[PDB]
Design a protein around this ligand. Structure first.
Ligand SMILES: C[C@H](N)C(=O)Nc1ccc2n[nH]c(-c3cccc(S(=O)(=O)N(C)C)c3)c2c1
Ligand SMILES: C[C@H](N)C(=O)Nc1ccc2n[nH]c(-c3cccc(S(=O)(=O)N(C)C)c3)c2c1
Ligand SMILES: Nc1ncnc2c1ncn2[C@@H]1O[C@H](CSCC[C@H](N)C(=O)O)[C@@H](O)[C@H]1O
Ligand SMILES: Nc1ncnc2c1ncn2[C@@H]1O[C@H](CSCC[C@H](N)C(=O)O)[C@@H](O)[C@H]1O
Lengths: 334, 335
């Protein structure tokens, strides 16, 4: 039920831990600070809607860039901590915390700018972008500023170092304890790779087996986008492996772009500094060995789950070299 | 919340590889049992063994290697199928017999000369598996029979969790990195991280320990009314004296278990010993208390099963810190 699903979802954000995690994410939090301060021209003297203000930090960054008024809308009980932070920084007169969903809140005026940190695992887990787009339609003036303004999604075949050690563990028992358990490699593979869950795990550049491929671009200003999101977003990809590796499946990640000076990009690439998002891993049922110039192709759609519209679903089709086309349907882990 | 529903959810954890990888990767735990079993070759060579919860079968195989003639590997989760294959692959399928199902209901062809079991949960008694080992002792161990391990001890000490101290202080550091003062959120963070009634499993070290650890219970597995003690709740009074000035966050408990020898082998989960998968079980007060050198800390702790889930550890804590009034807190193992 909606009532139950919202209450359960907002329960997460009424607790300190996820906000500690988000603000401790320097890459994420510095990116928004600099994205905002670099848009001082467009914000100074202007009104801002912060969609999902949480502890209020981004609304305060907007005030510090010289916005005349900032509506900090927060649906979870954390709105009380945002009010306390705004009062505590002496900005009660410039930042107004409004409890409740952005979909139903009443702003006194339309706004010149929206700022929101709406991105989930795999970019679209939690489906918060719908709330930002709802706010854009209803509260942003024609021509108004969107922070960030766009998002891009990337895919690449990976060999996951940590998964490889966990799979290989059972073959090393004999050397450690004088019992041969190498026969549980099959079992370990079914348990760790044969599930249909998206796995959130940080990779390094060494886990990446080809040139990453962009499979989608979301321009938040593009009319049509709400409908695209419920249809599902994605496309085809093609790439060539660098070398011999046990391929475990694919990583997807995203970046978002603030307008500038010059445009600031917040990346969640494994080639770039770690963020709380890590990457979203799509494991094959078992490893497939690949080689220099092995062709990996397929097609991916990100769409909301039927039973929970905040639950990211990934439909993957893929071909590794001369192995036949396969299909796998993933849902975000609990 | 039916018994058959609680059981199938519990055993579904053990039917998956992850827990068995974690346990076998725990060198301290796994070496202690290898060594504790092989050290006991005398009483095992040519003898019958019951392995209560054989899992992937590893301890059942240590016993065959120790020279046991017949080992019954009882395992209630679907992992018994993986144990059968491990035994087969190590060429031991005539000495080690994997029997599926709960030890409470399975049929051995005979009484056994030894029980071995790795029954220990977080805070020692989380999962309430000791009850199954004792059921099997009563029902299947011969008079004068051997138990591996033989005893367990519970320990308690006031702690100043350096990790929690960092997390509570985090909101005071926001102004320095980002130019926003969020120091006013310390109270909120304290309510969230300390104000709940969950036992937190977390690895401490000496720097976290505020006093001499106190033993608050000794479980001799051979002792008669132990099952009844477990139902009533095991525990006892404790008192200690703080080492220095510190924000006290609460208590850590841990356990060791002892195998008979050589000398007796002690598997310890103390924060002063090498790290295990069990770590320590943390009991936080609702908020920090400032203690000083020689600040007196005392109370009484009971460990017992929860009412709704009998496999869920509950801790009743009564404590007093200096001249603050006695307080009470009732903890249940985190899910
Ligand atoms: C949208 C925003 N920009 C964001 O980054 N949110 C974050 C940030 C940090 C998180 N740490 N863990 C989680 C998390 C953990 C478990 C479950 C879920 S959930 O089902 O999507 N949920 C919100 C209840 C989320 C985080 C979510
Ligand atoms: C008793 C045995 N000796 C042992 O050490 N068991 C272990 C060992 C490692 C574990 N890693 N995580 C868990 C764990 C994680 C979630 C839930 C639970 S549970 O409620 O107690 N349950 C079994 C369903 C347990 C472990 C249990
Ligand atoms: N439809 C909606 N209306 C209002 N707030 C929402 C919302 N959907 C999600 N939120 C809130 O949006 C927040 C996203 S997390 C980001 C919090 C804060 N802006 C920061 O950057 O640290 C959560 O607090 C969540 O409760
Ligand atoms: N009453 C019971 N009867 C049989 N098996 C049980 C049981 N209670 C718990 N178990 C099983 O006991 C095991 C304990 S943990 C794994 C122990 C394994 N012998 C090892 O040391 O690596 C789990 O596999 C669990 O499923």
């Amino acid at each position: 039920t909606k009532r139950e699903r919202d209450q359960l979802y907002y329960e997460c954000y009424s607790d300190v831990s996820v906000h500690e995690e988000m603000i401790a994410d320097r890459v994420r939090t510095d990116a928004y600070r600099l994205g905002i301060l670099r848009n001082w021209a467009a914000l100074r003297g202007k009104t801002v809607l912060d969609v999902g203000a949480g502890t209020g930090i981004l609304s305060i960054f907007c005030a510090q860039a010289g916005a005349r008024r900032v509506y900090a809308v927060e649906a979870s009980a954390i709105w009380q901590q945002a009010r306390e932070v705004v009062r505590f920084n002496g900005l009660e007169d410039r930042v107004h915390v409004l409890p409740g969903p952005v979909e139903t809140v009443e702003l006194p005026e339309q706004v010149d700018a929206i700022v929101s940190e709406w991105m989930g695992y795999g970019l679209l887990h939690e489906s918060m972008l719908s709330s930002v787009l709802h706010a854009r339609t209803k509260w942003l003036k024609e021509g108004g500023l969107l922070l960030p303004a766009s998002a891009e999604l990337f895919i690449v075949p990976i060999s996951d170092q940590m998964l490889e050690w966990r799979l290989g563990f059972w073959s090393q028992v004999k050397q450690h304890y004088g019992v041969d358990m190498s026969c549980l490699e099959g079992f370990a593979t079914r348990c760790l790779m044969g599930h249909s869950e998206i796995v959130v795990q940080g990779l390094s550049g060494e886990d990446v087996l080809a040139r990453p491929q962009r499979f989608a671009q979301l321009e938040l200003s593009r009319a049509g986008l709400e409908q695209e999101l419920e249809a599902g977003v994605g496309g085809r990809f093609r790439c060539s492996c660098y070398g011999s590796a046990p391929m475990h499946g694919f990583a997807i990640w995203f970046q978002v772009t603030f307008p500038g000076e010059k445009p600031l990009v917040l990346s969640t690439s494994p080639f770039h500094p770690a963020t709380h998002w890590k990457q979203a891993l799509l494991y094959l049922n078992e490893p497939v060995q690949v080689e220099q110039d092995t062709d990996v192709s397929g097609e991916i759609t990100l769409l909301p789950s039927r039973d929970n519209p905040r639950r990211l679903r990934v439909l993957l089709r893929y071909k590794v070299g001369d192995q036949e086309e396969k299909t796998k349907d993933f849902a975000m882990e609990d």
